[PDB]
Amino acid sequence: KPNLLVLPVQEDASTGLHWANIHKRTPLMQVPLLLDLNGKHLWVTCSQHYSSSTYQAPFCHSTQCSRANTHQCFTCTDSTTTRPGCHNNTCGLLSSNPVTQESGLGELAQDVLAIHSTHGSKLGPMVKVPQFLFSCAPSFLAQKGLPNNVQGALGLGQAPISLQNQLFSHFGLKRQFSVCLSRYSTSNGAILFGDINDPNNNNYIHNSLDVLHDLVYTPLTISKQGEYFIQVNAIRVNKHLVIPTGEIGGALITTTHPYTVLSHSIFEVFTQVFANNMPKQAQVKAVGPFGLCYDSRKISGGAPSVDLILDKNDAVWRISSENFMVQAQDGVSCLGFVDGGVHARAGIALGAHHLEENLVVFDLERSRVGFNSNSLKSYGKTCSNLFDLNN
Amino acid sequence: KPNLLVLPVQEDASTGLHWANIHKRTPLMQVPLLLDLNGKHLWVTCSQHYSSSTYQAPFCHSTQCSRANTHQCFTCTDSTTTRPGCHNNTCGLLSSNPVTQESGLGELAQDVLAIHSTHGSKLGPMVKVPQFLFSCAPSFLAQKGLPNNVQGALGLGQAPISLQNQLFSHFGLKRQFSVCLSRYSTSNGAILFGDINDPNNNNYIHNSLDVLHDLVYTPLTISKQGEYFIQVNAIRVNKHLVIPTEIGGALITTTHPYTVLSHSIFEVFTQVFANNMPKQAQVKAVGPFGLCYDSRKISGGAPSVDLILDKNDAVWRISSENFMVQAQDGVSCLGFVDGGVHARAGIALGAHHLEENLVVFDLERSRVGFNSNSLKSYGKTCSNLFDLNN
Amino acid sequence: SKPNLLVLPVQEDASTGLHWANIHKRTPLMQVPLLLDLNGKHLWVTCSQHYSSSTYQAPFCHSTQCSRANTHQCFTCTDSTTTRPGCHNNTCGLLSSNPVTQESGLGELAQDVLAIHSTHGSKLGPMVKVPQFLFSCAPSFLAQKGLPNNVQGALGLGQAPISLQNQLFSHFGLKRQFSVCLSRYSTSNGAILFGDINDP
Ligand SMILES: *[C@@H]1O[C@H](CO)[C@@H](O[C@@H]2O[C@H](CO)[C@@H](O)[C@H](O)[C@H]2NC(C)=O)[C@H](O[C@@H]2O[C@@H](C)[C@@H](O)[C@@H](O)[C@@H]2O)[C@H]1NC(C)=O
Ligand SMILES: *[C@@H]1O[C@H](CO)[C@@H](O[C@@H]2O[C@H](CO)[C@@H](O)[C@H](O)[C@H]2NC(C)=O)[C@H](O)[C@H]1NC(C)=O
Ligand SMILES: *[C@@H]1O[C@H](CO)[C@@H](O)[C@H](O)[C@H]1NC(C)=O
């Protein structure tokens, strides 16, 4: 019985989103799914080639339906014969495409999910959750916005049948998971489930020990919708402070958009403050979703300190200029923050690009988030080689 | 045929609010009324003691009631005899005390209003609007909260029978008015109606020409209730920027003296301010204020406070002689007040903010203009920018 | 230099029995045939791709112009993929009516030059302008039915804040009075007069 589980994830270069192959069903196979940090559950298109000797659709008012927190019954109005995703007297579950913000009523489903354990310092054998709960979503939901051929999403949000909650409870793990996304499409990053500070896991996490010793922590708050928040008191640029006005933190953490999104007033003030701490004669025609771009040849070694001042000024998340400068085009380097408009979900939403090449620990038992206080590269490490991810 | 009209206004030392004598009725006489920038109409208390040979109460469904945008008929339930403010089959108008936020149903009224024209560099003869529309309010409405002897309010809001809307239309003026409040109770400020860049008016406004050339503008937005808003992206204190929070987020108003901030913004701004000051010069807060200092110790230097505006095109610099208030003896307080958690807006700029500034409401281009340097840097004040002498 | 009386010639359409006027608008100034609608709340025009004017503007939502027009509903162009008069985002929406068909449609608030005759002695005098006249750019279908031939909108003289007379009264400081003398014959004009007719 494993004390640590590992899910390799990959960056999609085109969308900037991350996805994973999930192993499901009997016989076991791989389903490519979007990584959705705040997603309430795993959902898939089932109307396909769903072949499994282990599939079940729980009946309405069943114990499975109570756990999934759906007490709404499902009626199939597509096929008039039965299949995965289409029954009467089952239960309905609302699934959302976090990119398009579309939602649709899916059917609660139950089948095998499998995930890697560890063996010494390498990946170990797959272990199974034989009755993993998830949603069979309507086909349209995955037809737009996801990486190519991605057929659903896996959610890691604070909700009862999230992926991590089901792994924790099945295997009796510590309630902690860690995210190390890779910036490169050509090598994987990973998600780790369980305690990384467990001597039983020392051999697998041995290579990451210098990083772990320097981890910095800040309190984690959770919204009514199961989303992860931290408190950012200010954004510091050199000696300028952009200061936003028992509550949930103001900064969302998400994996479902690449760049960090700022509500309009913050975006406006921050970007100008940034432009003021830069050579005005280095700017070029704005490109892409970005508002402030430079000719890459100037600027070289000329970007300012950009830091998040965190809850109660106890901590700082220093952000590297190799992270916050984006290479929009051949020789064009852009400030990687985008305007969320005036009705943004949060004042600040830290996205996949922010998380990439950082180790970020979601410590649910103590309600806090930890991150590397120095860049991984300063340890000679990357998110792809911090842990052994060869099968 | 005048191109510019002038209304002198005065600060009430006690309340910090401003008022004007309006000339009305036949025979012409003076009515002291509160200056209410956002008010929808002029209202005055009416009784059997109201005397005028030109007063009328328009009938219900009249063209007058139509222009005033009231189609609710009025029934007098007070006197059992008719008098100004008390008739049947007239029309009803809701009037508000902007200070107490009490409101009352008045009767639409019509009478003479007079206001100064200009003659060269001086005030010229009074010119009249013989059928000025306004509200006869119930007597109780002004009985609390207004400066002494003030018996109504003149409203300059975006609403069909506001004072400026009726002056514009009657005289064929450019749709613009300018506010120059005087900080001193002992000298008048003014409101100007019509084009101030009008060569015809060059002689009256000649003394202000340097101020006008350097005016800075920002977009003006109007709420559904007719209030004036601008957009503030940040309040800057030295190098610390406080980001507040489409209609602008900052209300402009004349019905409270000090600038009111919503609780979350207030808390953030006052601490940021305390961080840019000698932290051990503070004294127990006095009055309505939250952060007060000893006057002898901070004469050293107050920090830069600027409103960063819409699209960051413009900056409204606030002088430390404006935002520091001398609450007591040797105590100077930061003159921003906490509007609480159900504040109407995030920022509400009040009379104190407006004082000794020239503020132009350009309704024709939907923008607000203000002096980009202090009046005092031009050798001017709001009392002497224009000739307000009889 | 401010006229005390303005005059708008109007003509009867024999086919429909309705009356219309050529109204002068834009820079450079040109004529638009519009239906005479006594009770109409505002002037509206079908505004097209080929609207040409150097003085045209679409007020922004929550502007003072939108306040005066009494509209606080914002406009979104759900039509073209490019902007044109009558088609922008972040402007304000105004409901216009075809009084013959009772069709209504949501237009965009617009601002441009309007000109009209003043008087000179006993004759018509030079055109005088309202440089920022407020009106509605209405959807094209709204004029396709019921109106005289080639008529592209209506001018309203109703009791409403941006009616035609209300804007003329206030721009020029006229007496609040207008007079109607319609002609029975399609072959000669009648007129609308704005201002005091009784100061001989
Ligand atoms: C305004 O209209 C009211 C309703 O018509 C008037 O009140 C009515 O007076 C009648 C005469 O005595 C009486 O029979 C009715 O019952 C009464 N109606 C109500 C609703 O009370 C009112 O008249 C004045 O006030 C009343 C109470 C009496 O004192 C009358 O003599 C008064 O004229 C009208 N007010 C005017 C015309 O000023
Ligand atoms: C007015 O705004 C709308 C909505 O913002 C624009 O319509 C969208 O244009 C985007 C392009 O950025 C498309 O991706 C959307 O599919 C469009 N939505 C709809 C409903 O058509 C529209 O282009 C804007 N119009 C103008 C003239 O700027
Ligand atoms: C679901 O119920 C409806 C209504 O009774 C029925 O017509 C339909 O065939 C049922 N669906 C399946 C898959 O049996």
Side-chain angles (χ1 to χ4, degrees):
Chain A
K1 180 133 287 203
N3 262 287
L4 196 73
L5 311 172
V6 184
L7 180 70
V9 304
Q10 190 175 126
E11 201 260 2
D12 176 62
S14 174
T15 63
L17 302 176
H18 294 250
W19 62 277
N21 277 318
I22 302 289
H23 293 70
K24 308 202 61 205
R25 302 167 199 184
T26 304
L28 211 62
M29 47 78 70
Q30 292 179 112
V31 190
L33 301 175
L34 181 81
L35 171 64
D36 184 6
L37 179 66
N38 295 308
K40 292 186 189 175
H41 60 257
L42 185 150
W43 59 267
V44 217
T45 304
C46 291
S47 67
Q48 344 189 51
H49 309 293
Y50 196 115
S51 296
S52 179
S53 66
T54 44
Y55 169 82
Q56 287 174 47
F59 59 82
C60 202
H61 311 116
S62 63
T63 53
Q64 294 98 328
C65 296
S66 181
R67 189 179 178 199
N69 198 27
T70 168
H71 294 84
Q72 159 182 356
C73 293
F74 187 90
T75 298
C76 194
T77 58
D78 291 333
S79 160
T80 200
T81 180
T82 72
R83 55 159 182 97
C86 177
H87 313 86
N88 285 332
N89 195 31
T90 44
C91 41
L93 195 51
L94 203 70
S95 302
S96 295
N97 182 326
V99 172
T100 65
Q101 292 293 102
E102 286 163 323
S103 66
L105 192 76
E107 189 189 53
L108 187 66
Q110 179 184 288
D111 209 332
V112 174
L113 177 145
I115 193 175
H116 279 282
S117 55
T118 66
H119 188 58
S121 75
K122 296 212 246 244
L123 290 180
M126 308 280 289
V127 289
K128 299 178 181 184
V129 182
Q131 293 138 306
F132 185 82
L133 300 174
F134 68 97
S135 174
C136 280
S139 299
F140 79 87
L141 197 56
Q143 278 175 350
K144 284 169 155 346
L146 312 184
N148 199 84
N149 285 112
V150 164
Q151 281 156 18
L154 60 112
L156 267 40
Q158 286 295 295
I161 57 160
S162 62
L163 168 63
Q164 84 281 359
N165 282 330
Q166 289 192 77
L167 295 176
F168 294 159
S169 76
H170 190 258
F171 292 102
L173 305 173
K174 168 165 177 311
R175 306 187 74 87
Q176 181 192 299
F177 67 93
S178 301
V179 189
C180 209
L181 305 181
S182 176
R183 170 171 304 155
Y184 320 104
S185 58
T186 55
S187 58
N188 288 344
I191 306 183
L192 271 63
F193 303 92
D195 190 11
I196 53 178
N197 301 313
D198 179 359
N200 291 122
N201 302 323
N202 183 54
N203 293 104
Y204 188 77
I205 56 101
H206 181 266
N207 183 67
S208 79
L209 282 173
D210 294 319
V211 181
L212 297 183
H213 296 165
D214 296 337
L215 283 190
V216 167
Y217 291 92
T218 191
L220 178 64
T221 44
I222 309 297
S223 73
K224 297 174 191 160
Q225 289 300 322
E227 304 154 297
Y228 300 107
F229 281 84
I230 55 173
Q231 173 57 24
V232 178
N233 278 1
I235 308 167
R236 178 207 284 146
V237 182
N238 291 340
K239 337 206 60 180
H240 289 274
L241 290 181
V242 184
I243 308 158
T245 66
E247 190 126 14
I248 315 184
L252 175 73
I253 309 169
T254 181
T255 53
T256 53
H257 52 67
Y259 307 120
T260 295
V261 170
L262 308 170
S263 62
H264 179 66
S265 204
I266 296 180
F267 174 81
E268 280 279 59
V269 175
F270 169 77
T271 293
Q272 188 58 57
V273 163
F274 190 92
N276 291 344
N277 284 267
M278 293 288 280
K280 184 163 209 156
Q281 42 290 350
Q283 310 187 10
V284 295
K285 286 128 183 313
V287 162
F290 301 119
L292 185 61
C293 293
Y294 296 88
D295 170 3
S296 312
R297 303 189 135 213
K298 175 107 195 52
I299 305 313
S300 188
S305 96
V306 175
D307 307 331
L308 308 180
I309 312 301
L310 304 181
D311 188 77
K312 276 184 190 329
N313 308 347
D314 292 301
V316 163
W317 201 343
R318 292 176 296 105
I319 306 174
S320 157
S321 76
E322 306 184 17
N323 183 303
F324 62 72
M325 292 303 298
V326 180
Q327 214 69 210
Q329 288 173 338
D330 198 329
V332 177
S333 179
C334 297
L335 177 60
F337 297 74
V338 308
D339 193 347
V342 298
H343 287 133
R345 164 66 188 95
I348 304 170
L350 307 167
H353 201 84
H354 177 88
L355 299 169
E356 284 166 0
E357 298 308 322
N358 293 291
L359 177 74
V360 186
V361 179
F362 293 81
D363 188 350
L364 311 166
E365 297 196 340
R366 261 163 299 202
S367 199
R368 65 188 187 160
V369 173
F371 52 86
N372 48 297
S373 57
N374 302 288
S375 73
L376 295 193
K377 171 173 83 172
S378 85
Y379 297 94
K381 310 288 168 42
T382 70
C383 269
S384 300
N385 65 34
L386 253 188
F387 309 100
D388 192 327
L389 302 174
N390 299 128
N391 297 280
Chain B
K1 273 172 188 213
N3 276 100
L4 194 72
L5 309 171
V6 178
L7 178 71
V9 304
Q10 188 175 310
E11 199 259 1
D12 177 62
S14 175
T15 68
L17 301 174
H18 295 249
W19 62 277
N21 277 316
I22 310 290
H23 295 70
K24 306 200 61 206
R25 304 168 201 187
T26 304
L28 207 60
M29 47 80 72
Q30 292 180 67
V31 192
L33 300 173
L34 181 80
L35 172 64
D36 184 6
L37 177 63
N38 293 308
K40 289 184 189 174
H41 62 256
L42 185 152
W43 60 269
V44 66
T45 60
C46 294
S47 69
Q48 62 281 19
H49 304 298
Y50 187 123
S51 180
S52 177
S53 68
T54 42
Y55 165 85
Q56 287 173 45
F59 58 82
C60 201
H61 312 297
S62 60
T63 54
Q64 295 100 331
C65 298
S66 180
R67 188 179 178 195
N69 195 25
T70 169
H71 292 268
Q72 162 182 358
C73 290
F74 187 90
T75 302
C76 194
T77 53
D78 287 329
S79 163
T80 54
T81 55
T82 66
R83 58 196 185 186
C86 177
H87 310 84
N88 280 337
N89 308 306
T90 40
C91 44
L93 199 53
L94 196 67
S95 301
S96 281
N97 179 324
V99 167
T100 67
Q101 284 167 88
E102 285 167 323
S103 63
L105 194 81
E107 188 186 51
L108 189 65
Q110 179 187 286
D111 207 333
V112 173
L113 175 144
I115 189 177
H116 278 110
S117 54
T118 71
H119 183 58
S121 77
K122 284 220 182 48
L123 291 178
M126 311 282 287
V127 292
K128 299 179 180 183
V129 182
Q131 293 88 21
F132 186 80
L133 301 172
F134 68 99
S135 174
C136 276
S139 65
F140 84 95
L141 198 57
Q143 279 177 334
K144 284 185 299 188
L146 309 183
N148 191 277
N149 285 24
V150 160
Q151 266 246 52
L154 62 111
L156 299 174
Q158 288 297 294
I161 57 160
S162 62
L163 168 63
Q164 83 280 357
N165 175 292
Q166 289 192 75
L167 295 174
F168 294 163
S169 74
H170 188 74
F171 293 104
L173 306 175
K174 168 162 177 12
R175 303 187 74 86
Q176 180 194 104
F177 66 96
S178 302
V179 185
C180 209
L181 306 183
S182 175
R183 85 172 319 141
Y184 315 101
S185 56
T186 61
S187 63
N188 287 343
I191 307 185
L192 272 66
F193 302 90
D195 188 11
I196 49 178
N197 313 279
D198 184 356
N200 295 29
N201 302 321
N202 196 333
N203 294 319
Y204 185 78
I205 59 101
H206 180 265
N207 183 66
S208 79
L209 281 173
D210 39 6
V211 181
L212 297 183
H213 181 69
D214 297 340
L215 281 186
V216 159
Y217 299 92
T218 191
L220 177 62
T221 47
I222 305 296
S223 70
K224 294 172 186 56
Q225 288 298 322
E227 304 151 299
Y228 298 103
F229 283 87
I230 57 170
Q231 172 57 25
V232 176
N233 277 1
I235 308 166
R236 180 171 63 210
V237 179
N238 290 340
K239 311 190 205 186
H240 296 170
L241 290 94
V242 183
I243 314 308
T245 64
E246 291 292 344
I247 298 186
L251 172 72
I252 307 171
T253 181
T254 53
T255 54
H256 55 69
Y258 305 124
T259 298
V260 176
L261 308 171
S262 67
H263 180 69
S264 62
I265 300 178
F266 174 79
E267 223 65 64
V268 174
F269 171 78
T270 58
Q271 186 61 57
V272 161
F273 188 92
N275 292 346
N276 284 266
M277 290 288 283
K279 77 181 154 285
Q280 210 92 22
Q282 309 183 3
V283 304
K284 188 180 57 172
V286 160
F289 306 117
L291 182 60
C292 297
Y293 294 78
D294 167 277
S295 312
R296 112 189 159 272
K297 302 188 207 148
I298 66 100
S299 162
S304 318
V305 175
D306 304 335
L307 311 183
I308 317 299
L309 303 180
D310 184 90
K311 270 300 178 111
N312 313 319
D313 305 70
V315 163
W316 202 344
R317 182 152 290 158
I318 308 175
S319 157
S320 74
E321 305 172 21
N322 184 299
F323 66 72
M324 295 307 301
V325 184
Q326 184 68 60
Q328 252 164 21
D329 46 276
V331 177
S332 296
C333 296
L334 176 63
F336 296 75
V337 178
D338 194 343
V341 296
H342 297 293
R344 171 64 181 90
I347 302 172
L349 308 170
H352 197 86
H353 181 86
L354 300 169
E355 285 165 2
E356 296 307 321
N357 289 292
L358 176 70
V359 184
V360 177
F361 294 79
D362 190 349
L363 311 167
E364 173 195 300
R365 301 190 51 170
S366 196
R367 65 188 185 164
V368 181
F370 53 84
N371 48 294
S372 56
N373 302 285
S374 72
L375 293 192
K376 176 176 173 146
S377 86
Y378 298 96
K380 311 291 169 44
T381 71
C382 270
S383 301
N384 64 37
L385 191 59
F386 307 104
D387 193 324
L388 307 181
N389 289 318
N390 301 222
Chain C
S1 100
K2 145 217 168 174
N4 286 289
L5 191 71
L6 310 170
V7 180
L8 181 72
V10 166
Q11 190 173 113
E12 198 260 2
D13 178 63
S15 173
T16 63
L18 301 174
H19 295 251
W20 66 279
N22 273 315
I23 306 290
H24 297 73
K25 307 270 298 290
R26 304 169 202 184
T27 309
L29 209 60
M30 48 77 71
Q31 292 183 110
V32 194
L34 301 175
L35 179 81
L36 175 68
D37 183 8
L38 176 65
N39 292 308
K41 289 183 188 173
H42 61 255
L43 187 152
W44 62 268
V45 198
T46 50
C47 292
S48 66
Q49 185 65 59
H50 304 295
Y51 187 121
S52 179
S53 179
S54 65
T55 41
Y56 167 81
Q57 289 170 44
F60 58 81
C61 202
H62 311 295
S63 62
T64 53
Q65 293 102 331
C66 295
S67 180
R68 190 178 179 197
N70 194 28
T71 173
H72 292 268
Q73 156 180 357
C74 294
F75 185 90
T76 298
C77 193
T78 56
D79 170 17
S80 158
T81 57
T82 55
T83 70
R84 58 174 179 88
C87 175
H88 312 86
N89 284 336
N90 306 312
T91 40
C92 344
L94 194 50
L95 204 65
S96 298
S97 284
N98 179 325
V100 173
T101 69
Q102 289 169 271
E103 285 163 322
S104 66
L106 193 78
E108 190 188 53
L109 186 66
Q111 178 185 288
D112 210 332
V113 170
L114 179 145
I116 184 180
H117 280 284
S118 54
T119 63
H120 183 248
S122 77
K123 299 211 192 146
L124 290 180
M127 309 279 288
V128 288
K129 300 181 181 83
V130 180
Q132 292 92 22
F133 186 80
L134 299 173
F135 65 98
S136 175
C137 277
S140 65
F141 81 85
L142 199 56
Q144 281 174 353
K145 248 189 312 277
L147 310 185
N149 198 276
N150 201 33
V151 161
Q152 287 158 56
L155 61 114
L157 296 174
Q159 286 295 295
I162 61 158
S163 62
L164 169 63
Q165 83 280 358
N166 183 280
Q167 288 191 74
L168 295 175
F169 293 160
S170 76
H171 187 73
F172 293 104
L174 303 172
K175 174 164 181 313
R176 304 188 74 86
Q177 181 195 287
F178 67 92
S179 302
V180 182
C181 207
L182 305 183
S183 177
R184 227 187 225 154
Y185 319 101
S186 57
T187 64
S188 59
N189 289 345
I192 319 289
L193 268 64
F194 302 89
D196 188 12
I197 54 177
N198 227 350
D199 186 12

